[PDB]
Design a protein around this ligand. Sequence first.
Ligand code: LMN
Ligand code: LMN
Lengths: 365, 365, 365
Amino acid sequence: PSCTNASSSRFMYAFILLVGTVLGAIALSPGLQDTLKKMPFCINSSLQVDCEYALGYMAVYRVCFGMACFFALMSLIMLGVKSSRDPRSHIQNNFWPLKFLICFGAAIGAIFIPDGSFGPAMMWVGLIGGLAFILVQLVIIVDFAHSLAENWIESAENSRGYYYALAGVTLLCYILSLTGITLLYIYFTTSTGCGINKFFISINLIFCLAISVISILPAVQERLPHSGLLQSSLVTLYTVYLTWSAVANNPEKECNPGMFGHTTRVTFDTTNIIGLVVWLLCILYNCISSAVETEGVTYSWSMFHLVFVCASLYVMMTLTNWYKPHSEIELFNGNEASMWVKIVSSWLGVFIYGWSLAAPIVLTN
Amino acid sequence: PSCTNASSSRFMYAFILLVGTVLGAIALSPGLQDTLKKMPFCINSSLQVDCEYALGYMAVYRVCFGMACFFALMSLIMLGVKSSRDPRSHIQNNFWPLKFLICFGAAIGAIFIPDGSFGPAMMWVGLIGGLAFILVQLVIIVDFAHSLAENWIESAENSRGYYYALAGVTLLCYILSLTGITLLYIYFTTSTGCGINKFFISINLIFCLAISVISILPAVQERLPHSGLLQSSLVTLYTVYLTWSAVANNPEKECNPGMFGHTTRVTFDTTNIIGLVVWLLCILYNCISSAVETEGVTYSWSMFHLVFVCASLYVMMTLTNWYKPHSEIELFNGNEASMWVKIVSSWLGVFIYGWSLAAPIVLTN
Amino acid sequence: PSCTNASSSRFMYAFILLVGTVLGAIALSPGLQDTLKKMPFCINSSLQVDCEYALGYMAVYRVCFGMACFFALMSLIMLGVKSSRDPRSHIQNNFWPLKFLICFGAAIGAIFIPDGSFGPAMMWVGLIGGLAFILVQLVIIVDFAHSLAENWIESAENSRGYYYALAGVTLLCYILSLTGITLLYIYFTTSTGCGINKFFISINLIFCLAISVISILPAVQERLPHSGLLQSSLVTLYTVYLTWSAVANNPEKECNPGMFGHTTRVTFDTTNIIGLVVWLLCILYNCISSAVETEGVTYSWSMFHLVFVCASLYVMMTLTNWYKPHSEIELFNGNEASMWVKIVSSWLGVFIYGWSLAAPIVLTN
Ligand SMILES: CCCCCCCCCCC(CCCCCCCCCC)(CO[C@H]1O[C@@H](CO)[C@H](O[C@@H]2O[C@@H](CO)[C@H](O)[C@@H](O)[C@@H]2O)[C@@H](O)[C@@H]1O)CO[C@H]1O[C@@H](CO)[C@H](O[C@@H]2O[C@@H](CO)[C@H](O)[C@@H](O)[C@@H]2O)[C@@H](O)[C@H]1O
Ligand SMILES: CCCCCCCCCCC(CCCCCCCCCC)(CO[C@H]1O[C@@H](CO)[C@H](O[C@@H]2O[C@@H](CO)[C@H](O)[C@@H](O)[C@@H]2O)[C@@H](O)[C@@H]1O)CO[C@H]1O[C@@H](CO)[C@H](O[C@@H]2O[C@@H](CO)[C@H](O)[C@@H](O)[C@@H]2O)[C@@H](O)[C@H]1O
């Protein structure tokens, strides 16, 4: 009755966000839209280089602003709700076409916003939202790892069917992370040119070893028996991903060969694909009867919409490769304020996991 | 059954007003529509300067007139209702697409109204509606402040979690208001040129201090214990906002540097954004099971629609920056009849709050 | 169940008539449609002056003919009904989109009717319908005045809240009527040129004084205590309105300064706006559970549709300012057959009220 319709609503909102992202990403195609994008919002006209070179980025900004506003509004409405008997529960579950048309309407109206001062404000808002959503998806990954490891250990160790896979998953994740760290050492640093990259990569490797060291010692396993190695494995893979994605945006042509060492600067590579896939997996696991974010409500109706606002901003930032608006083309898709945010996010996430796993042991002895 | 559908209707009307405002504001874009707006309603042709320079303003007038008429009509229908069993309750809750199409139909029909005598009449109607809605939203803000302060004081003071925030909110609002009053002193007045601004700002500061002085004395707190400082803080912030918005329209180029000291005169700044945000918050708090505006009806079905008529007129005025139609471009977006209305509204609002807070104390001793 | 759906139907028919009137009045715009109106129905071509000068008038005729036919047909169907159990009750309440599409379909089909002999026949039909609907709305106004005066006197005189308003309404209506009669004396007559206007205005003033004299004497109040002054006040205001609207169409350039003393002759002034507002108020008060026009039916299903036919014809006539088709432009929007109909309607209405108020007193003594 009520619960199944509420969960169907939780999935309908995910479908809304998905349709919005797919519609936003149809832009920035190499030649199929970069000439069509000249009509919609540059009729108003360091501004000229941005209107002339990167059109898909502006289109993505104007599209995702609409979804951010829609989900912020839905968060403001569903504020203070206590039980499923409130009259506002009736508007969250029934009227779907109105919601679709409002969301898209907002996108179409926002596309008319001219350029000149809209860029940088949204860059800062996107940085904040990206930090928030990175931390949220780290929490989701940790919860999923706990659940999976516990389930396989409890249900499978009576047999030999899943134990092999239980070892193989963590072995494959470790070898992927190690090959990735070696590829970083090989490519994204020189002999004596860039030291900051040799600092970032090395300190992330140190944290990724200390985390798996602390995750196994028996004093922690005494409280919960399933400390295992899978959790630390998935976490270290994710942290290596963030290390690579953060070093990718180094605004120094001395060493960085990614972009620095052409009629456009909009690019789409394997990095963005991996990012979107991890994003989608986290969003779907958030909606499957989970709160890893009659009387009583399972999930707070406002925190859910706030999480979707953060997710929409994260998509805004990751589809545009975290660039700085109104910058000359020689700088070419790299800013300095994004790498620090990403790497501080990675460090805070490693701290969160290492603390939540071994807080009382350190508090006592 | 009945109540949940009635509240869903109260929110559907807010969605109607929101869609109308968003559609009205897509106009007045700097170059994306100012050339398209030449066909619709100037084919008829101090009138020529208005048709040639400010097209977005006329489009906004013609759009918002339709919503004003629609909500006035809905107010006239739902007149005299007593209980939820009347046959007219069936038409207020069910037929939504007809209502959407009637409202938009009215907008599309009104866009055909030619120029020449339509402007000034609507300017006066908009002034009256703006006065009414400013006072309404002041009442809503005062009620919200009472509710929030009472809730936090009663539920939180047993702990230390919210007391810090209870002090921080009022501290932040006070520092914002003080920095704003200082910025007004710095910018919107000269040494010896404009004295009327040094009068308005100073007298508003005097009222904003006396209000917080009276809000704290123990004789008033004897009746209600939660007199506090949050109410006076939010009220003084709102009054400083109105002081700034009223001084912005001074029709004197001697001192005012806002607009006085270009192919168009339609502008959109941070002032309009703050105005629209406060507007939206007040409209949403009006609809959340509140009447701060089986047998018996919670809210009078006609007063609600009258409040929405006033709200639509207020949007009409604030999206067009309160200008005077059919005025030469040198005057440039400033009239004299708006500043007096805004400031008299501010003074009457301060009087309303100061009276409602300390009426019986003054009546007795 | 049945009653609420029947009343919703009574309001849906009013919405149909409103949408039809709004669509008909979008025409006759000064330049926005007078060039577009050259294609639709003059491809067929004292006829040429009407096709060349007044296009909005013909468009309004062709539009309102469709609604007249639709409501006449609905009147013919719902003939002889006795109870709410007849099978024809099922078609009056359910199938709305079909009705909308039939009505508009009829309008679109009627727009194809060519010119040459369609004008004058519809002028005479419109005169008859206008007489009928003027008398109907007079009856509605009298009933409303009785209801309002009785309600305020019975519920309010225990207090002092509404007595002031009960006097103020009648005072304001009297002063409006007197200023109007003086403005007529000043403007619409000369010193010795037009005597027929000095006859009409003076005799209407005499009737409007005698009516208020008879409405107060105690012999009439003996039967019903609420004879009062409000009824006579609203009635005399309405009669002064009809006097002004009838004198406006005097086909004499000697005195009349309204139109007599330009590429078109279609005009739209404050007269038409007041007319449409009074029309809308009467139509809405007709539908609010009233018959001022299980077993048993409250309102006769055929008389309602006949009243709407008369209303549609009245709108047809008042949107076109009661002009004579196929007349030379020098005559310019004034005919002689309309003023007599309007003024005879006014006199018959004053007679109806004066009789219904004081019939038995005169019959006995
Ligand atoms: C829920 C809310 C729904 C809101 C809907 C709003 C719809 C707004 C439509 C906006 C839009 C299409 C783009 C839409 C993008 C949508 C993206 C959707 C994405 C997801 C799917 C309309 O395109 C217009 O194009 C015009 C081309 O002539 C037509 O003009 C016809 O002839 C006219 C002769 O005067 C008549 O006047 C008009 O009547 C006619 O028609 C217009 O009819 C037409 O509307 C904008 O197109 C633009 O095209 C350019 C010429 O390429 C226009 O001209 C430029 O303007 C100067 C300004 O400074 C420039 O400096 C200059 O270069 C140039 O002069 C622009 O002005 C603008 O119009
Ligand atoms: C629920 C109610 C629904 C009611 C719907 C009503 C729809 C009314 C449409 C109105 C409108 C579009 C704008 C609509 C704006 C909508 C805004 C919506 C906003 C939210 C989304 C129709 O545009 C017309 O444009 C014409 C252009 O030629 C076409 O003419 C075609 O060829 C013809 C050859 O003779 C045929 O005769 C016709 O048959 C053909 O088709 C018309 O077919 C077309 O309809 C008005 O456009 C205007 O365009 C201009 C030329 O730019 C027209 O010419 C001007 O008029 C003089 C007058 O004095 C001017 O002095 C002069 O400069 C010029 O001569 C205008 O007259 C007017 O037409």
